[PDB]
Subunit: 213 residues, 3 copies
């Protein structure tokens, strides 16, 4: 949380477009400069060479009680962030949802938990991030509790509307109220680093490069 | 102990671990082997379990064509029970894949051979003076899931499923139903149907 | 113990040897060399070189790393911060560093893959070392998975993982490992032309 109360904050398309050229590392270093951890440890890229940027649409699961359906609600440009207590014994994403995502402008799926139909996901080149791969259905194993509620994954809060950026290094949560400022800082981090890389690739010591830049 | 009909094996060749698991669920059976991951991207196998039990301190000549070797090494990470020699043997003798409760070596060879290997991970220390073959063609227990010699193994990118041989026809039939239904749902989704519309 | 240099021709001969062969050779001397859980992060890569060790501790050095080194970085197996990323990858490519082995995690995996740099670690993450972990010392002994790694040891890593070869035994282990592969080649060729495994062993 922040020094100001939480408020749903729209994020300009331009800020999202900029994230096309930003790595999770830059965004994480920017967040760190604001005193905030953003990484979701253990939530790994499952499809080589993929990445996504979009607005968190949150999904929270709970134990079966009763005594995929939510996906029709998810806006174009969303990254779905699903929390199932880090469970490895059932999956909360598969082929139907993947095909749906691809047909409905959904950018990627981040899972505190596991997914199935990995071959379809790979074949579709869909940006899936999860704690792993399994095949057993959610049916009679876990059930939807609520969507568009705050999630807490490894102590990191994800609010509906937060900026999600994911790549080969994993997933970063950027609070919506800070998104423009974090993206600005991340761009500056990338610029400084590019000069450092250019320097060491021209025979500078790292020592030299780091304090000329 | 029961052979499986060839037509059941043939149908299964176009089924997924998800379809088979959903079918098993409908019969009240868990099929999945948690933690036993695909080690070779893009591979799959369907075949008959030939079982191998190791114990703390070869058999391959006995393995029938069309077998999927399922080897239990108590989930150990300090030694391996599959490597290059066995991969090359499998490929020359119609062996369809290997599933290991434990780890495998010569991962680079397995990948280059496109061999369907499924394991708890990758390592290089040899079984020799670490683990020894105890028995073959005995029932195995992996993550509480029993595997009998003869059971139908189906393995892909999502992991490995054990289908009890005595029920294989019913499971495969149900699994085909699950798959046919989903194909229709996916078709409708691609033409722009809502998920609710598609499930109606 | 003694610091033991290793001839370039031994390194060159080791260039194509699989980690399985080196482990089998080590076993013949009664030595465990494998680092379980330290997994290849860049499909199809491998490295051979001399361990330059780096120890981190809870809350730079790379200019001191000789060409031909494999950097072995110990970070208590931590998953919350990374000790390798894009700057260091481009440094290694410009300075003849052969690969990096991490007891912990690395970032900028997409750059590392694109540079085809041989990286081995317990995984992938993006959070910086800054204000999370700090350099303790270099060229000190490390302990990873109960295996002691001395600066100067021969490191060999591939798809199957990472092997530590004690420098005093390195030349012997490489020669034995070559023998292992030659023996196995004859077996594989017998198998591939239709021999039983039994016949192929003899
Ligand atoms: Cl699905
Ligand atoms: Cl072997
Ligand atoms: Cl770096
Ligand atoms: Mg399906
Ligand atoms: Mg960077
Ligand atoms: Mg070999």
């Amino acid at each position: 949380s922040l020094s100001v109360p939480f408020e749903y904050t729209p994020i300009a398309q331009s800020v999202l477009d900029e994230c096309e050229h930003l790595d999770t590392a830059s965004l994480s270093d920017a967040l760190d400069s604001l005193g905030i951890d953003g990484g979701l440890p253990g939530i790994a890229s499952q499809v080589p060479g993929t990445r996504c940027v979009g607005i968190a649409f949150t999904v929270q699961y709970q134990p079966v009680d009763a005594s995929a359906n939510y996906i029709d609600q998810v806006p174009s440009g969303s990254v779905i962030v699903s929390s199932n207590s880090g469970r490895h014994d059932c999956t909360v994403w598969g082929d139907i949802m993947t095909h749906f995502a691809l047909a409905n402008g959904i950018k990627g799926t981040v899972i505190d938990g596991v997914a199935r139909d990995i071959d379809t996901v790979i074949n579709c080149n869909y940006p899936l991030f999860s704690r792993g791969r399994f095949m057993q259905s959610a049916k009679n194993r876990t059930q939807l509790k609520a969507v568009q509620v705050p999630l807490v994954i490894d102590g990191i809060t994800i609010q509906p509307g937060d900026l999600m950026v994911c790549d080969g290094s994993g997933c970063v949560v950027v609070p919506q109220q800070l998104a423009a400022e974090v993206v600005l800082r991340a761009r500056a981090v990338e610029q400084t680093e590019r000069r450092i890389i250019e320097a060491i690739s021209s025979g500078s010591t790292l020592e030299q490069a780091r304090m000329t830049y």
